[PDB]
Symmetry: C3
Subunit: 143 residues, 3 copies
């Protein structure tokens, strides 16, 4: 796992559209952005049928209804080298305040922004541009 300093060298290269203060002791705190966010409104029948999304204008605050999953576009764009992978964990503040999210991975070689799924246990809200996820960088044994 990469330390605060090692992650700092990734800014502008591996992690684009970053925020310096978001580089933590041992990870980077991903933020949610975008002109819009999405609310899943009808279940998926995988793998053939994806869930039905309701598009919502992401103004200053995203309003979430209890028992619904929402998709957010990350502020950050990623350019993963075949040498690194990232474990996406949830920021503790979100976990302790009633938000759910499963663990997922940004695989080596991945390019682009990432869309994260946050499920609201209660009617609640998340501020646009706030940090929601704690990224842990893992190095592959072989590229």
């Amino acid at each position: 796992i990469l330390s605060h300093q090692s992650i700092k060298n990734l800014l502008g290269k591996v992690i684009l559209n970053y925020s310096e203060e978001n580089v933590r002791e041992n990870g980077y705190d991903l933020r949610i952005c975008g002109d819009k966010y999405y609310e899943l409104v009808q279940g998926a029948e995988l793998p053939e049928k994806k869930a039905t999304l309701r598009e919502i204008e992401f103004k200053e605050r995203a309003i979430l209804s209890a028992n619904h999953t929402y998709l957010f576009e990350s502020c950050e764009e990623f350019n993963m080298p075949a040498d690194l992978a990232v474990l996406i964990t949830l920021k503790s503040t979100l976990a302790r305040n009633g938000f759910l999210a499963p663990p997922t991975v940004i695989d080596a070689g991945y390019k682009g922004k990432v869309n994260v799924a946050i499920t609201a246990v209660y009617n609640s809200s998340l501020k646009k541009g706030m940090a929601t996820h704690h990224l842990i960088f893992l190095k592959l044994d072989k590229p």
Copy 2:
């Protein structure tokens, strides 16, 4: 974490009943199989009382009700060395399509198939034999 190459040499030895296609850039995608799957219908009173399960025939597609947790047996059987461990994360497609799952680990020394717990946020379904989880291989500092 083991790369695609390292995981490939695990097939037939550490990962049985596998699919060569499921070996990813830095992980193996576990699949759900079995003649049956289970639905939790009554809550647990841990550790003394486990949750009450309803057994359901796993035909070709497993139907899930919103706000219920389901147990699926993996197609893959594991034979973990005292030198390796596995972090079970959720496949992104499942996360983004309204399925929840907590992070868990297959510890060194573990033998057998794994029963994974997927919680449905919406009435939905998952195809029998489809990939649902993204396995990351962790090597112990000492066997």
Copy 3:
């Protein structure tokens, strides 16, 4: 990640108020304890407004209502070094028995007990002092 023996050497200094039996093959099993636990009753409006908590006496068992998130104080107190971090995952028994928890991390330098959030999918209960989470220790590339 750190192995069983490596975790034993952390008892008394990195992991306080521990239980020897809770040291596993490749992790430490955190326990829930404390005079009381908390039920989230009203959603959060992050980051400005945290979720509204209801304080509940934690006697011998913690009774949880379906679709509610609860905060538990860990028995264990941590004193993380500058080159060690912990990935908090859920014990498989809790996952398979209908309890949800998102992945979170105890960062290098962190000092104190941790409050974990468990979301109940069903009306259920958890015994005071029982193991709920499986801690995986990660070493930083640089302190």
